Amino acid sequence: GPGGSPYLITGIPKDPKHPLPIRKDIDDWYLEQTRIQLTLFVEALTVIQNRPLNDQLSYFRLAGIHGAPWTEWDGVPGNPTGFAVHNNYTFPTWHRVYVTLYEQVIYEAMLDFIKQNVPQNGKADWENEAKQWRLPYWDFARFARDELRLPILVTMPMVKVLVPGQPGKQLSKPNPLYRFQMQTLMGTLERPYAITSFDLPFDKCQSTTKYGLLENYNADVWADGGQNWLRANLALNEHPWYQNLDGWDSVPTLQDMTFRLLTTGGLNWGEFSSTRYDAPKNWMNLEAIHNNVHNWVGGFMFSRPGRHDLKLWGAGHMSSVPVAAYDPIFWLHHCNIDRLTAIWQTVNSGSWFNDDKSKVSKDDDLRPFHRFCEKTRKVVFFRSDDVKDWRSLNYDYAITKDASRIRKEISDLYGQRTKEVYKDFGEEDYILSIRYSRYALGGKPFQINIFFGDVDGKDFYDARSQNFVGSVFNYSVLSVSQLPARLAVHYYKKQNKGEVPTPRYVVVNSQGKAEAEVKVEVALHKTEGTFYDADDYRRVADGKRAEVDDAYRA
């Protein structure tokens, strides 16, 4: 660490005037200030982003822990892989520590900012705000203040901040949450830090981008492809195709998935914590939802075959495990994944590494994260049990302050629209199970799209594609996910004399082409009763690969 000793991760230190401060919803937090906390977060994160690459607490090196360029960090040596855990049962706990590292570094930068910039009259007030501040979360599953959206702040290129010592003065500055920008293309950073198999030109980017990388544009456009936040919002609101037709109400699949994740009882830790697969009702897991959000924020398709005026594709850092951590929204996404873990823990309190598969991983060192063990007086790595109680890291969430009311809060935040629309149809539920190998395309990402009915051989991509039901993203031993299917099955039955649909799937690569030799096991399952009134699911149809037009075949 800095000054030649391990960097001890503690969370923000405990102050008795500041009992368990909460991580707030970033839109609520911004809206109440649209101002010292906003100023401190902006100015501290700007400093951290501008730190040199040799500084291990620079934004670049902190993001670098996750994936590329796969260097050492804090004395811990660095298919090339990073420190991050994916497709294993420590996925939530490794990321709980990682988010806390980021929050702690930001807090320390806030204190430094105050020491260097704030006059005597205001130091105590500004220090007080730094001590109350916690990293906000992005509630990707909550309607923004009728639709799911990226945070307001992430969509603003500039942000107004206070000028300490100049009352009433504010300055507009580049917003460090909008993008992370380096001084040169990341493929040409000083060794060993160059970002350089990847199937997207991330070596040619200077800044992070959402949907900005498309084939057939000048390579200098890729240096900074922009933040297509409207396109990301569209993706985040994915739902079955039939719901864009007149006379049908829509429900965002991400909100239905999240409501199911939090409300479904009976999962063990191994089922909840990960996509890893060594009863399909239990395949709705945290990591699978997290994987889809990565795709929907960044985009993963660089190209599409054929000629298309409207170009709905485009790729960006958040879809790509090696470089997703560079996008500032990464940390806000993982702050909410940590919040979801804390909520699920609260309503499943005995289910902690409690199954035979996850028990084996409970004691894994969560490298490269150090802490001082007070019992053995040694610097050690974090382990999952150290962070079972997130409050040991001196933060909390409003929703986990009161267990007795958490089930009503879950329903109010995530369940209203699902229940409103589901209530219009009979008392049955349908789900799709999906099982795949994350290595099926040699480690390259891919998207599994499911359809009920005939597939358009030139349009098999998203909610605009005929008969689309939903998607599963391989964000770079098998892997499982689950999709809601209740509403899409109802629509199909109405057009097909009551017949249960055969799920048809297409595996799409980053060129927009269908991969014919990626195995996916898809099935449709039914139970009597609605899921939120809970069941006994039974398989009712087996999946089949769909064919596409010859020009659209990999």
CB count within 10 Å of CB 130 equals: 22
End-to-end CA distance of the chain: 46
Closest CA to 287 of 266, 261, 259, 267: 261
Q: Does 172 bind a second copy (CB under 8 A)?
A: yes
Helix (H, G, I), strand (E, B) or coil at 515: coil
Binding site partner of 509, from Cu ion, a second copy, none, Cβ cut-off 5-8 A by kind: none
Our CA dihedral for 546, 548, 552, 554, rounded to 10 degrees, sits at: 40
Q: Which is nearer to a second copy, 42 or 393 (CB)?
A: 42
| Contact (CB, 8 A) for 424 and 478 | no
* Sequence-ordered list of residues with C-beta below 8 angstroms from that of 437, at least 6 positions apart, any chain: 477, 478, 479, 519
Q: Does 84 bind Cu ion (CB under 5 A)?
A: yes
The least distance separating a second copy from the CB of residue 362, rounded to whole angstroms, comes to 42
Q: Which is nearer to Cu ion, 82 or 453 (CB)?
A: 82
CA 382 to chain centre: 22
Q: Does 52 bind a second copy (CB under 8 A)?
A: no
Q: Does 488 bind a second copy (CB under 8 A)?
A: no
Q: Which is nearer to a second copy, 131 or 142 (CB)?
A: 142
Six-digit token string for 224: 């900074």
Identify the residue among 250, 263, 447, 449 touching a second copy (CB under 8 A).
250
Q: Does 53 bind Cu ion (CB under 5 A)?
A: no
Q: Does 224 bind a second copy (CB under 8 A)?
A: yes
Map tokens 């909610």 to a residue.
463
Site for a second copy in 279-308 (CB under 8 A): 307
Closest CA to 135 of 66, 44, 55, 2: 44
| Contact (CB, 8 A) for 246 and 233 | no
Identify the residue among 197, 218, 349, 404 touching a second copy (CB under 8 A).
218
| Contact (CB, 8 A) for 190 and 53 | yes
Q: Which is nearer to a second copy, 238 or 271 (CB)?
A: 238
- How far apart (Å, rounded) are the C-alpha atoms in residues 206 and 28? 31
Annotated binding-site residue? 334: yes
Identify the residue among 310, 356, 374, 442 touching a second copy (CB under 8 A).
310
| Contact (CB, 8 A) for 40 and 404 | no
Q: Which is nearer to Cu ion, 481 or 527 (CB)?
A: 481
Q: Does 190 bind a second copy (CB under 8 A)?
A: no
Identify the residue among 217, 412, 420, 553 touching a second copy (CB under 8 A).
217
Q: What is the CA radius of gyration of the chain?
A: 23
Closest CA to 152 of 327, 326, 332: 332
CA 83 to chain centre: 17
Q: Does 314 bind a second copy (CB under 8 A)?
A: yes
The interaxial angle of helices 91-117 and 123-132, nearest 10 deg, is: 180
The least distance separating a second copy from the CB of residue 409, rounded to whole angstroms, comes to 24
Q: Which is nearer to Cu ion, 84 or 347 (CB)?
A: 84
Q: Which is nearer to a second copy, 59 or 395 (CB)?
A: 59
Q: Which amino acid is at 337?
A: I
- Angle among Cα 293, 299, 302 to the nearest 5 degrees reads 155
Q: Does 311 bind a second copy (CB under 8 A)?
A: yes
Binding site partner of 147, from a second copy, Cu ion, none, Cβ cut-off 5-8 A by kind: a second copy
Q: Does 487 bind a second copy (CB under 8 A)?
A: no
Give the binding-site size for a second copy (rule: CB under 8 A): 43
Binding site partner of 84, from a second copy, Cu ion, none, Cβ cut-off 5-8 A by kind: Cu ion
| Contact (CB, 8 A) for 487 and 426 | no
- How far apart (Å, rounded) are the C-alpha atoms in residues 487 and 500? 12
Segment near a second copy (CB under 8 A), from 434-442, 456-464, 467-475, 479-487? 456-464
Write out the residues near Cu ion by the rule CB under 5 A: 84
Residue ranges for the known binding site are 66, 86, 95, 290, 294, 334
Residue ranges for the known binding site for Cu(2+) are 66, 86, 95, 290, 294, 334
Write out the residues near a second copy by the rule CB under 8 A: 30-31, 34, 146-147, 152, 155-158, 171-172, 181, 183-184, 206-207, 214, 217-218, 220-221, 223-224, 226-230, 234, 237, 239, 244, 246, 250, 307, 309-311, 314, 458, 463-464
